Amino acid sequence: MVEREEAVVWDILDEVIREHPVLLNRAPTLHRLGIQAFEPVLIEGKAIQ
Amino acid sequence: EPIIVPSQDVVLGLYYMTRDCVNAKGEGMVLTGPKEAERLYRSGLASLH
Amino acid sequence: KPLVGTGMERAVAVDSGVTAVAKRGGVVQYVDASRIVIKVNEDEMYPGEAGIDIYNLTKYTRSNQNTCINQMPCVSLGEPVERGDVLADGPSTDLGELALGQNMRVAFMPWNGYNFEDSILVSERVVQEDRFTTIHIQELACVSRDTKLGPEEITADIPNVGEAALSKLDESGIVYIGAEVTGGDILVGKVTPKGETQLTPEEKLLRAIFGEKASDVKDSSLRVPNGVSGTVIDVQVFTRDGVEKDKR
Amino acid sequence: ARVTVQDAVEKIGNRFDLVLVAARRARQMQVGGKDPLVPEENDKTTVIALREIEEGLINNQILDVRERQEQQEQEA
Amino acid sequence: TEFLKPRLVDIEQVSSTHAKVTLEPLERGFGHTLGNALRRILLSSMPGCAVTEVEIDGVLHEYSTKEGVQEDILEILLNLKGLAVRVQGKDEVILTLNKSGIGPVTAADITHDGDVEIVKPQHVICHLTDENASISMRIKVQRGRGYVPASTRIHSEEDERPIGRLLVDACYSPVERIAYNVEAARVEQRTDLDKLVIEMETNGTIDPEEAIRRAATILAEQLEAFV
Amino acid sequence: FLKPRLVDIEQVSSTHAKVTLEPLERGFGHTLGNALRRILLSSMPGCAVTEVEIDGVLHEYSTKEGVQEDILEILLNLKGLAVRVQGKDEVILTLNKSGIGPVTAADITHDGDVEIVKPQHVICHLTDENASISMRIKVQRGRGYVPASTRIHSEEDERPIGRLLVDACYSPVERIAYNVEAARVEQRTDLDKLVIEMETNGTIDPEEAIRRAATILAEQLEAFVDL
Amino acid sequence: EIKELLKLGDLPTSGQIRLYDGRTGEQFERPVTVGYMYMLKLNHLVDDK
């Protein structure tokens, strides 16, 4: 189903994204202020907003 | 200290907001609420300062 | 080209070797794309087998950065030149003149966070006209023709697939002359022998019956790089030093 | 959505032990061991556990009670 | 060519404060063509009712004194502009306030005409302190469209040369706050379409849903030449 | 609440014109003129070449043996051609040119539905006489910028790889400015006269467009009337 | 010479026109800096990131 990216599985994808905490850590991070947590939003792009 | 201090763009935004001068359209009238004050400048029948 | 430069635009074209220059003047006779046939004026036309010059242009090739380079014909048909003028355009050049990018109507106004210090805001008109686009023609090396384990052949015996993959793999088992390869297809077929220790006794006997090479030669071809979707334009082949290939 | 967790601090303010406890509760919710009591608002188990602690209905006290309660239910 | 139709609207409601409309789906700049539109229309093109003039009687100034008042005639004027009123088959109407004694002069003590309906009679106009406090005003409420500041309207009768009237800002806007927001809507396999979310508030001379269908008719009105 | 109305569309040139609306009310013509702008830049059924299967071209990274330009270039010059369709949404043509000369856009198999705005638009340059280049041009109709990129995901398994595609930008409209000013009628203080100064590429007619675009606004009012 | 060419064109002596937002249509108070500059895209591509 995901082999064809069925619109169905995207709604299942939704279910596993709605309130799923995410951790964001940059590379040039030397101090702890480069690590936080957020909430996902479906973005049609290549870069992490 | 709440580490995140408005850097530059956002600072200027609020800086051009809260600011005073001598010449401005409507300078002198009275309003019973900042709510209609909102609907006063979004229309633009008076100056922001 | 930059409208407001300093006057060294043609100076880049002349002091660089990205544009095909003329060593003699004269009416161009047959300009196509990969060739520019020139007729030279007699005042500077050699008394040695007359004088018809030629300039060959690189047509959509690769570079170090694997970026595309194409000498674009700036001279049309029936147009004379001077001993020191241009015939082609290297990458990022306009009439020889150094033309790096393009100039637009730039403005400086704060506007809904799309410009925070480094953040830039551009009109969709750019990619709607496709003015700023690049071409990445890439080269991937392939090996074949005798690995000590067994003399290799290109494609020949190709298992693990049907005939769907061969729709673009001709009578040589090589990729088409302009295919749309994507995801995980195969570029060129590469065959390689297997091994002694791994053959089972129930396939050593059946091995010495159904041919000379039953379950020995496998499919270990060079495949389309995982994660790319492009178009094969040119094939650079090198036949065995001494013995030719087969047909392609 | 959830603006802060300062209300969790009002009840159980360890800031770390919180993580431990409610996480185990969310796992009993995963494995069919149990099920929630506070209706979810599309919130997956993590955020659901957060609500439970801020109101203060299912904290460490009650969770250990549930543990020993299941012990009478499995034994007999 | 294939066009798409606006559907699914979440009428998020909280009493009289705000209603937030969530409609899906929108396209490249449709959350703008929609949002911006409502804003300017709800500001300088929306019919409503509000006080235009207030003749006290003797004192026709805002910075004076009136024995029996804990406020100032100035504060009185502000509450007058904020009074939520709505008429039906009348344009302009003048009422009368006849109050005396120690107490909050609410919007109920005014004279209620067969068209003048104070939607919030609880709205205290002015605070009236101790003893006598003989206050009596002649108020002029009018029907208009938008917002008429006194700054641009320098009355040609008793304010150009004389006094006898006061100049307030008639708020003919049945709303209070216009905050439209753009947020990525999402069609399953498709890309990022948009979802217009409108945080809109109304005073009381109209409730959220009615207001939506109202301007909708006026939009068809100003699109009547073609659509 | 006077209805709105246009006047004769002042055709200064075939490429650009100007409409004028006299019956406008305070505020409407301004925000609605901006609202129309987005619509007259989005929901517009444009025409764009999608699939061009060329004679001796397996890929656009080649040059026809007999032409001066490059195939990639020629495809952009095909996007430079403004064409109209009347009945069908899609039509396949065939360019047939031979002989030394700037290939005008009138040598193609001209269907009664295919309608060029300027048959003088040179697509490519033939430099030889024995080179008859032929190419089937599959052009269709849709709205907004719809690239071949977003369309190759379905693909329909395009095995015939002699078929080289191009990005379909479906936008006839171009530059839209609106001139708001005092509308001088003798019975009113001042109304609004919207002089819509428009630029087009020259494919779809303005009036057709504005009634059609206002009907799309009607689509976008549907749920705004529905509560 | 510069101002002379803005005068030699039908352009503003200043080089700052009052624009009308494509998302509003109002005058960006105090004419804004406008004109052409030669851009330059770098070889840093997101597919290599």
From Swiss-Prot, chain B:
This is DNA-directed RNA polymerase subunit beta'. Belongs to the RNA polymerase beta' chain family. DNA-dependent RNA polymerase catalyzes the transcription of DNA into RNA using the four ribonucleoside triphosphates as substrates. It comes from the Bacteria. The RNAP catalytic core consists of 2 alpha, 1 beta, 1 beta' and 1 omega subunit. When a sigma factor is associated with the core the holoenzyme is formed, which can initiate transcription. It comes from Escherichia coli O157:H7.
Swiss-Prot record, chain C:
DNA-dependent RNA polymerase catalyzes the transcription of DNA into RNA using the four ribonucleoside triphosphates as substrates. This is DNA-directed RNA polymerase subunit beta. The RNAP catalytic core consists of 2 alpha, 1 beta, 1 beta' and 1 omega subunit. When a sigma factor is associated with the core the holoenzyme is formed, which can initiate transcription. The lineage of its organism: Bacteria, Pseudomonadati, Pseudomonadota, Gammaproteobacteria, Enterobacterales. The chain holds residues 697 to 944 of 1342 of the full protein. Belongs to the RNA polymerase beta chain family. It comes from Escherichia coli O45:K1 (strain S88 / ExPEC).
UniProtKB/Swiss-Prot annotation, chain E:
It catalyses: RNA(n) + a ribonucleoside 5'-triphosphate = RNA(n+1) + diphosphate. GO terms for cellular component: cytoplasm; DNA-directed RNA polymerase complex. Its EC number is 2.7.7.6. It comes from the Bacteria. Residues 1-227 are annotated as: Alpha N-terminal domain (alpha-NTD). One of its GO terms (molecular function) is DNA-directed RNA polymerase activity. One of its GO terms (biological process) is DNA-templated transcription. The keyword Nucleotidyltransferase applies. It is an enzyme of class 2 (transferase). Keywords: DNA-directed RNA polymerase, Nucleotidyltransferase, Transcription, Transferase. Homodimer. The RNAP catalytic core consists of 2 alpha, 1 beta, 1 beta' and 1 omega subunit. When a sigma factor is associated with the core the holoenzyme is formed, which can initiate transcription. DNA-dependent RNA polymerase catalyzes the transcription of DNA into RNA using the four ribonucleoside triphosphates as substrates. The N-terminal domain is essential for RNAP assembly and basal transcription, whereas the C-terminal domain is involved in interaction with transcriptional regulators and with upstream promoter elements. Belongs to the RNA polymerase alpha chain family. This is DNA-directed RNA polymerase subunit alpha. It comes from Escherichia coli O157:H7.
UniProtKB/Swiss-Prot annotation, chain G:
It comes from the Bacteria. The modification N6-acetyllysine is found at K7. Belongs to the RNA polymerase beta chain family. DNA-dependent RNA polymerase catalyzes the transcription of DNA into RNA using the four ribonucleoside triphosphates as substrates. The RNAP catalytic core consists of 2 alpha, 1 beta, 1 beta' and 1 omega subunit. When a sigma factor is associated with the core the holoenzyme is formed, which can initiate transcription. This is DNA-directed RNA polymerase subunit beta. It comes from Escherichia coli O45:K1 (strain S88 / ExPEC). The chain holds residues 1194 to 1242 of 1342 of the full protein.
